[PDB]
Design an enzyme around this catalytic site. Structure first.
Site, PDB file in Angstrom:
ATOM      1  N   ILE B  34      36.851  51.679  33.834  1.00 18.09           N
ATOM      2  CA  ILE B  34      36.962  51.767  32.375  1.00 18.09           C
ATOM      3  C   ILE B  34      37.983  50.810  31.792  1.00 18.09           C
ATOM      4  CG2 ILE B  34      36.337  54.201  32.430  1.00 18.09           C
ATOM      5  CD1 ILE B  34      39.396  54.648  31.511  1.00 18.09           C
ATOM      6  N   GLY B  35      38.414  49.835  32.572  1.00 16.20           N
ATOM      7  CA  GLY B  35      39.288  48.792  32.073  1.00 16.20           C
ATOM      8  C   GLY B  35      39.708  47.893  33.212  1.00 16.20           C
ATOM      9  N   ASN B  36      39.946  46.622  32.918  1.00 19.62           N
ATOM     10  CA  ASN B  36      40.725  45.801  33.814  1.00 19.62           C
ATOM     11  C   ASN B  36      42.044  45.458  33.119  1.00 19.62           C
ATOM     12  OD1 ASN B  36      41.674  42.910  34.825  1.00 19.62           O
ATOM     13  ND2 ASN B  36      40.627  43.973  36.507  1.00 19.62           N
ATOM     14  N   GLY B  37      43.143  46.052  33.591  1.00 21.38           N
ATOM     15  CA  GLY B  37      44.491  45.658  33.174  1.00 21.38           C
ATOM     16  C   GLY B  37      44.896  44.373  33.886  1.00 21.38           C
ATOM     17  N   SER B  38      45.978  43.752  33.409  1.00 26.34           N
ATOM     18  CA  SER B  38      46.548  42.560  34.064  1.00 26.34           C
ATOM     19  C   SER B  38      46.684  42.869  35.548  1.00 26.34           C
ATOM     20  CB  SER B  38      47.922  42.169  33.470  1.00 26.34           C
ATOM     21  OG  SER B  38      47.846  40.974  32.708  1.00 26.34           O
ATOM     22  N   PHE B  39      47.528  43.864  35.820  1.00 21.58           N
ATOM     23  CA  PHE B  39      47.910  44.263  37.173  1.00 21.58           C
ATOM     24  C   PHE B  39      46.800  45.016  37.896  1.00 21.58           C
ATOM     25  CE2 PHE B  39      52.099  44.041  34.942  1.00 21.58           C
ATOM     26  CZ  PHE B  39      52.689  43.071  35.737  1.00 21.58           C
ATOM     27  N   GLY B  40      45.734  45.331  37.177  1.00 22.66           N
ATOM     28  CA  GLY B  40      44.480  45.634  37.827  1.00 22.66           C
ATOM     29  C   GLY B  40      43.750  46.775  37.185  1.00 22.66           C
ATOM     30  N   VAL B  42      41.553  50.136  36.016  1.00 18.99           N
ATOM     31  CA  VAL B  42      41.723  51.518  35.645  1.00 18.99           C
ATOM     32  C   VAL B  42      40.367  52.172  35.732  1.00 18.99           C
ATOM     33  CG1 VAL B  42      42.475  53.151  33.941  1.00 18.99           C
ATOM     34  CG2 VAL B  42      43.465  50.846  33.957  1.00 18.99           C
ATOM     35  N   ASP B 153      57.144  47.759  25.606  1.00 10.88           N
ATOM     36  CA  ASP B 153      55.793  47.376  25.255  1.00 10.88           C
ATOM     37  C   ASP B 153      55.104  48.439  24.369  1.00 10.88           C
ATOM     38  OD1 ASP B 153      53.832  45.445  25.093  1.00 10.88           O
ATOM     39  OD2 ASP B 153      52.746  46.197  26.899  1.00 10.88           O
TER      40      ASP B 153
END
Lengths: 361, 353
Positions: B34-40, B42, B153
């Site tokens: 359900i997502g690609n964050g920077s660090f990877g 989700v 952030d």
């Protein structure tokens, strides 16, 4: 501080504005300039940007009205008056006027009006899921490097290279670098603000509020644009510096301890990964020489990056040195070879490659 | 990671975020990215056990150091902070390589999604929700700051909402740091519209007040329907700020970065004129006290919870648009109040238990 402007209504009758303005280049030999069809087309941070038409020639122009600090001399203007180059937007005139029913005076800069920009082109193609023909990529990138070689030769850094700032004539394919509002002449020894460049295009050393940075920041930025034209989207995106350094690291690998000292002035310090094969980055039929160019522009260490002039002489531009080369629409390319002595002063032996046999004849 | 079957059920030995280090067998299904964050990545999934829904955030783990995001998450327990239910290790990518998996409360919406929907419909978020959300964020800050931890952030993406209960939860702890005096911090941390002046100048001796400014930016943006200090560039950001707050005085500037002698002379814009005319005075006043050049001048979260703008929240007859009671607003702890305990008498009104 002074000078008046007058507003006659024509036989049609359009609003005509007539001012008495100084020439960009040349000596102070003021000129009556007269324009009409005044529209607001941009509005920059510091004031506004209009388009207009010169009543005599009919040529369109842009006028950049900015608030004027009566106190000190204007840094954008002083630079724009120094610069004279086929790949740099031209300052036809400037004058002072009053906005805005107040004590305050405005500086107006009159400039070549160019509608298209690299930004808009890249986007049009990107929307359509297409790739910009490599030949424009070479043209545009090469011309930008000329402008950089030129300004850098005077120790001036643009500090704001991005696609919105590269103007194009659509027929000629000429590129003119614009918007010198962040530009400054760098003196080694004297420090500079670090918050100058725009977000996709900031060099790692800026991302770390370095203030001892050099002109190679423009080269980093320029390497970012190249890669974006190749990829059809920014190479180093993020809403945050952290986000952007991740992306950079993903591609360049992990900065060495020494490199991390070069940029961050503290070593010191939170990410870690190993070197990306650069060729895994782009579409598969991407020209290898383009990818090489990128890697030599996007270096962690600032002195490791090519100078503008060296990039101009890079393999990826060989096709522009071809005598047969023409644009897609079969006109000739713009002049790419009438280098000046100024332009080559960084390294004159490069004219050897830069100037092809055919262009000497 | 032991995979079994329908359809697909994963079973892991995972350790609770809170309490004693005692791991349990935990099983889960219905596993979507359900997502690609920077660090990877989700994921989302369902616990077979409770049927509850959860998010699993996965990151590459260097065994060289302990993971800071995890260290921080295990300290925290607060109703306005996404809870860490469990964590566990795995090697989803084929290598001798280790992923840390954070199993989190799943929360459907965010303040960023919700703000946008209103802005596309050319409406504003009703002021009651603005109060509910901002207050809850300010609590969450008051809490983390009391352990001396800065989020670094704060932005609308990082504020999760449950629409039905109006609970808000602070959520993305990857840039958070327990600050210490005289220890420098990187200046590249906060997201673009939300960065405090000192950050924009690469200050490295900044305080927890960076988060407060960031909150002030969120508030203003909810009031206005768009970011208050936008720009693709530090310069552009500063110009906008200056337009609103006037030109900084000379020491205000030195305070941000010393080296900076170093600016255009713009007169301070009446705060009153910055907003739509329907806009509540108390909100504007709150804005002006959150969005201050000098870091020590801005409100502490706690002081912000106590502001007149939040008074309707203290009304005993206050109810959610959908008829339900408010969520928890007053269950403060000692820990939360440490900054300034006499505020209790404001923050905990007479009817609250």
């Amino acid at each position: 501080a002074f000078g008046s402007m007058k507003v006659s209504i024509d036989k049609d009758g359009s609003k005509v504005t007539t001012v008495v303005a100084t020439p960009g280049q040349g000596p102070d030999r003021p000129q009556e300039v007269s324009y009409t069809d005044t529209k607001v087309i941009g509005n920059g941070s510091f004031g506004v940007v209009y388009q207009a038409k010169l009543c005599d020639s009919g040529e369109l122009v842009a006028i950049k009205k900015v608030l004027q600090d009566k106190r000190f001399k204007n840094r954008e203007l002083q630079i724009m008056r120094k610069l004279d180059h086929c790949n740099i937007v031209r300052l036809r005139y400037f004058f002072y006027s009053s906005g805005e029913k107040k004590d305050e005076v405005y500086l107006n800069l009159v400039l070549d009006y160019v509608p298209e920009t690299v930004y808009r082109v890249a986007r049009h193609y990107s929307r359509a899921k297409q790739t910009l023909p490599v030949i424009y990529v070479k043209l545009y990138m090469y011309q930008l490097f000329r402008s950089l070689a030129y300004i850098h030769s005077f120790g001036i850094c643009h500090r704001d290279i991005k696609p919105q700032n590269l103007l194009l004539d659509p027929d000629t394919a000429v590129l003119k670098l614009c918007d010198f509002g962040s530009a400054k002449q760098l003196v080694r020894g004297e420090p500079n603000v670090s918050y100058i460049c725009s977000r996709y295009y900031r060099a790692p050393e800026l991302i770390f509020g370095a203030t001892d940075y050099t002109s190679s920041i423009d080269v980093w930025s320029a390497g970012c644009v190249l890669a974006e034209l190749l990829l059809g989207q920014p190479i180093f995106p993020g809403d945050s510096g952290v986000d952007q350094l991740v992306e950079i690291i993903k591609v360049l690998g992990t900065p060495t301890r020494e490199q991390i000292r070069e940029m961050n002035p503290n070593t010191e310090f939170f990410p870690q990964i190993k070197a990306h094969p650069w060729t895994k980055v782009f579409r598969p039929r991407t020209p290898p020489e383009a990818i090489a160019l990128c890697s030599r522009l996007l270096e962690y260490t600032p002195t490791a990056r090519l100078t503008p002039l060296e990039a101009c002489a890079h393999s990826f531009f060989d096709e522009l040195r071809d005598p047969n080369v023409k644009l897609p629409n079969g006109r000739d390319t713009p002049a790419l070879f009438n280098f000046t002595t100024q332009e080559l002063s960084s390294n004159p032996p490069l004219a050897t490659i830069l100037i092809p046999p055919h262009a000497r004849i």
